[PDB]
Design an enzyme around this catalytic site. Structure first.
Site, PDB file in Angstrom:
ATOM      1  N   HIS A 275      15.307  60.948  45.097  1.00 51.83           N
ATOM      2  CA  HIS A 275      15.428  62.167  45.877  1.00 51.83           C
ATOM      3  C   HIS A 275      14.158  62.492  46.651  1.00 51.83           C
ATOM      4  O   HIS A 275      14.202  63.403  47.498  1.00 51.83           O
ATOM      5  CB  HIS A 275      15.913  63.341  45.007  1.00 51.83           C
ATOM      6  CG  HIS A 275      14.931  63.857  44.014  1.00 51.83           C
ATOM      7  ND1 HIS A 275      13.703  64.378  44.355  1.00 51.83           N
ATOM      8  CD2 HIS A 275      15.048  64.003  42.675  1.00 51.83           C
ATOM      9  CE1 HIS A 275      13.094  64.800  43.261  1.00 51.83           C
ATOM     10  NE2 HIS A 275      13.884  64.573  42.225  1.00 51.83           N
TER      11      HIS A 275
ATOM     12  N   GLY B 134       7.209  69.783  41.635  1.00 47.69           N
ATOM     13  CA  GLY B 134       6.453  68.584  41.904  1.00 47.69           C
ATOM     14  C   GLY B 134       6.218  67.704  40.711  1.00 47.69           C
ATOM     15  O   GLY B 134       5.497  66.708  40.833  1.00 47.69           O
TER      16      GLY B 134
ATOM     17  N   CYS C 213       8.457  65.938  39.287  1.00 48.64           N
ATOM     18  CA  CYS C 213       9.380  64.814  39.365  1.00 48.64           C
ATOM     19  C   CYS C 213       8.630  63.494  39.389  1.00 48.64           C
ATOM     20  O   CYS C 213       7.597  63.367  40.047  1.00 48.64           O
ATOM     21  CB  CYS C 213      10.225  64.937  40.637  1.00 48.64           C
ATOM     22  SG  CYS C 213      10.910  66.600  40.890  1.00 48.64           S
TER      23      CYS C 213
HETATM   24  C1  X77 Z   1      16.583  67.263  46.025  1.00 48.38           C
HETATM   25  C2  X77 Z   1      16.940  67.814  44.650  1.00 48.38           C
HETATM   26  C3  X77 Z   1      17.562  66.695  43.821  1.00 48.38           C
HETATM   27  C4  X77 Z   1      18.006  68.898  44.831  1.00 48.38           C
HETATM   28  C5  X77 Z   1      15.689  68.397  43.979  1.00 48.38           C
HETATM   29  C6  X77 Z   1      15.036  69.486  44.521  1.00 48.38           C
HETATM   30  C7  X77 Z   1      13.911  70.037  43.951  1.00 48.38           C
HETATM   31  C8  X77 Z   1      13.386  69.527  42.762  1.00 48.38           C
HETATM   32  N1  X77 Z   1      12.215  70.107  42.171  1.00 48.38           N
HETATM   33  C9  X77 Z   1      10.972  69.781  42.565  1.00 48.38           C
HETATM   34  O1  X77 Z   1      10.017  70.394  42.140  1.00 48.38           O
HETATM   35  C10 X77 Z   1      10.734  68.735  43.539  1.00 48.38           C
HETATM   36  C11 X77 Z   1      11.522  67.945  44.312  1.00 48.38           C
HETATM   37  N2  X77 Z   1      10.687  67.144  45.028  1.00 48.38           N
HETATM   38  C12 X77 Z   1       9.443  67.463  44.689  1.00 48.38           C
HETATM   39  N3  X77 Z   1       9.413  68.418  43.799  1.00 48.38           N
HETATM   40  C13 X77 Z   1      12.411  71.254  41.260  1.00 48.38           C
HETATM   41  C14 X77 Z   1      13.883  71.469  40.947  1.00 48.38           C
HETATM   42  O2  X77 Z   1      14.528  70.680  40.286  1.00 48.38           O
HETATM   43  N4  X77 Z   1      14.419  72.570  41.447  1.00 48.38           N
HETATM   44  C15 X77 Z   1      15.841  72.852  41.344  1.00 48.38           C
HETATM   45  C16 X77 Z   1      16.127  74.275  41.765  1.00 48.38           C
HETATM   46  C17 X77 Z   1      17.607  74.582  41.619  1.00 48.38           C
HETATM   47  C18 X77 Z   1      18.423  73.618  42.430  1.00 48.38           C
HETATM   48  C19 X77 Z   1      18.130  72.177  42.074  1.00 48.38           C
HETATM   49  C20 X77 Z   1      16.641  71.873  42.177  1.00 48.38           C
HETATM   50  C21 X77 Z   1      11.714  71.239  39.914  1.00 48.38           C
HETATM   51  C22 X77 Z   1      11.248  72.394  39.315  1.00 48.38           C
HETATM   52  C23 X77 Z   1      10.661  72.381  38.108  1.00 48.38           C
HETATM   53  C24 X77 Z   1      10.647  71.246  37.444  1.00 48.38           C
HETATM   54  N5  X77 Z   1      11.148  70.137  37.925  1.00 48.38           N
HETATM   55  C25 X77 Z   1      11.693  70.124  39.131  1.00 48.38           C
HETATM   56  C26 X77 Z   1      14.045  68.430  42.206  1.00 48.38           C
HETATM   57  C27 X77 Z   1      15.161  67.888  42.807  1.00 48.38           C
END
Ligand code: X77
Ligand code: X77
Ligand code: CL
Ligand code: CL
Ligand code: NA
Lengths: 301, 305
Positions: A41, A143, A145
């Site tokens: 992703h 971040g 991930c």
């Molecule tokens: C594209 C996709 C799959 C929807 C996505 C988006 C954002 C992230 N998150 C990144 O922080 C992130 C992404 N790229 C860099 N950082 C965060 C995350 O899951 N929020 C979620 C908020 C609700 C909807 C789904 C995503 C995150 C936060 C805390 C701990 N873990 C991860 C993960 C995945």
């Protein structure tokens, strides 16, 4: 003596952590030999997180669209491929700090260490378990991930988890290092939610054995139970079923302490019924379920 | 989101651990530059254990009495001396993996990571606090002596603890890396016991802030208090006094969450006087006191090293 939530030493993994940037997105990658593994992703655009088609997004990328930074060194991407939900970036330099390692897919109830990283740099290390509902109760910020979970029995790093996303109750979902998710989760923004979680019974029993090994017997009683009666009771408290496999796994700890597995089951049944009456077990006022039988034998040796 | 007991990454310390053997005794040493540090009690026999004359035992020792093994490589010992309760072995090779480091002596209530080692090999890492009674509630088996505790600041390892011994209740005693004991303990086999312990108040408040940041709010109330009134409650419940410096240290979390240190103190006062009423905070049914204010800020803001 003593009993702590204990992680594996993280150095062998620290030497593998890199930063991966695609467009405006930055996250962590794992650099082993000449390959950097990260969540696919990273190529998801901000404008469409709901229904990305990763095959179509990836075919549009050039090698130079991926920026990989290992401490102060830029690494040159020379190829890329997708395996399930993991992206594999081939780089022109092999990591000289690559440890002995393997990839393993774990079962619910298994524990592992997590090295939480941001921008390719380590923040801290903690112990986790794969919950019965295929989430982990992590500590992860925006971040994180690409941070990974691992065990290091016998000088070989077994990578078992790569972090991908946060679910709405604040628990976490990810994949093995072949990119297959644990549980029914998907790497896009949906209404997905963790199922009702349950307590990992075999682990609670292991931890009661650890308490006895450490010198505390206050919770034992004069009773035993059949396996089926134990499960009928335990499931009323949202405990996972205890299988004959689990009973077999606890054999060594039973043998060491003199407490038959089903006699320890009777103790747990009574603890669920009564609570702790102001007492603690290994410093906790609740029943702990993120130590496996293997963990207990390792730490009590 | 989420909140875990979290240790520092241990890699910089793993590269410093060696095995030290004297006679039939093996334990761990810390190899920095061309010196290996370990507990002086490595030179004690089981007879000497009761009343060791460490001056005389060391005088009797020579360099070759000490075997130092870094993985599979023997390090040649070329000198030896003692500083307080720590033995220093001069070796002929500087550790190429020595990190930027300092020796620091910590205060009760401060936390640190422990790298538990056996036979010079790292085995696990955990977080713990220096208790007010100067013990640590560690997890250590026979032969863990010489394992160290540390904090990291950027690229700099601050070593604060070397493990020496286990007390009868199963808690642990040790020294700073200059060999000065934490607490009223001695490195010999005698009658020694942990004193009555207290709870680290500023750390409990920090953890309550962590709980609020993570959406656990049921314990907040309309009331505020004063330091004097709160400290009378603290004394009653064997909590450490809360000083004005503690309040200042929490100021940040106070400003960020909207709960002033005296407002949060009112939550803690009520929790002490009434209990939790069957509820949990951050997955615990007890008030947790081994997270400092700095620990909470670093974990909730994602500080890296
Ligand atoms: C594209 C996709 C799959 C929807 C996505 C988006 C954002 C992230 N998150 C990144 O922080 C992130 C992404 N790229 C860099 N950082 C965060 C995350 O899951 N929020 C979620 C908020 C609700 C909807 C789904 C995503 C995150 C936060 C805390 C701990 N873990 C991860 C993960 C995945
Ligand atoms: C010589 C002296 C100071 C009396 C001593 C003796 C043994 C050790 N212990 C070593 O295991 C050990 C010693 N040398 C190699 N290993 C252990 C230890 O403290 N038992 C104590 C039992 C009471 C009387 C002796 C101390 C130990 C166990 C678990 C965790 N921590 C340490 C420590 C100190
Ligand atoms: Cl497994
Ligand atoms: Cl002496
Ligand atoms: Na209040």
């Amino acid at each position: 003596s003593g009993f702590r939530k204990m992680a594996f030493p993280s150095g062998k993994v620290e030497g593998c952590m890199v930063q991966v940037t695609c467009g405006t997105t930055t996250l962590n990658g794992l650099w082993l030999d000449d390959v950097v593994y990260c969540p696919r992703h990273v190529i998801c655009t901000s404008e469409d997180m709901l229904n990305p088609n990763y095959e179509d997004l990836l075919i549009r990328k050039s090698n130079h669209n991926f920026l990989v930074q290992a401490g102060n060194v830029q690494l040159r991407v020379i190829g890329h491929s997708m395996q399930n939900c993991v992206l594999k970036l081939k780089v022109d330099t092999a990591n000289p700090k690559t440890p002995k390692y393997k990839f393993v897919r774990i079962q619910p109830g298994q524990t592992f260490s997590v090295l939480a990283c941001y921008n390719g740099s380590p923040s801290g290390v903690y112990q986790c378990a794969m919950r019965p509902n295929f989430t982990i109760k992590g500590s992860f910020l925006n971040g994180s991930c690409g941070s990974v979970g691992f065990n290091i029995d016998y000088d070989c790093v077994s990578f078992c988890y790569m972090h991908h996303m946060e679910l709405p109750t604040g628990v976490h979902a990810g994949t093995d290092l072949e990119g297959n998710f644990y549980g029914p989760f998907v790497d896009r923004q949906t209404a997905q939610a963790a199922g009702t979680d349950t307590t990992i019974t075999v682990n609670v029993l292991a931890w009661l054995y650890a308490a006895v090994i450490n010198g505390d017997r206050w919770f034992l009683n004069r009773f035993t139970t059949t396996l089926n009666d134990f499960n009928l009771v335990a499931m009323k408290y949202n405990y996972e079923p205890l299988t004959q496999d689990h009973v077999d796994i606890l054999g060594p700890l039973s043998a060491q302490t003199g407490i038959a597995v089903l006699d320890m089951c009777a103790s747990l049944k009574e603890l669920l019924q009564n609570g702790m009456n102001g007492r603690t077990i290994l410093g906790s006022a609740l029943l702990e379920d993120e130590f496996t039988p293997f963990d207990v034998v390792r730490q009590c040796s």
